[PDB]
A = this chain, B = another copy of it.
Amino acid sequence: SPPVSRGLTGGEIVAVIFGLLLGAALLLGILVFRSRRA
């Protein structure tokens, strides 16, 4: 887990969690509103 200039950087981590969280989160929501908003 290097600082920078490598295949791993702070922006890379925060980026993955950003799309992974908002991605799955929003996905679940829409799925619930689809036809099971209980």
Contact = CB atoms under 8 A, between A and B. Distances in A.
Interface residues of A, number: 19
Contacts of A18: 15-16, 19
Interface of A: 7, 9, 11-24, 27-28, 31
Interface SS of A by simple majority: helix
A33 B1 CA distance: 32
Contacts of A21: 19, 23
Contacts of A13: 15
A1 B21 CA distance: 21
Contacts of A31: 28, 31
Contact of A28 (B19, B20, B27): B27
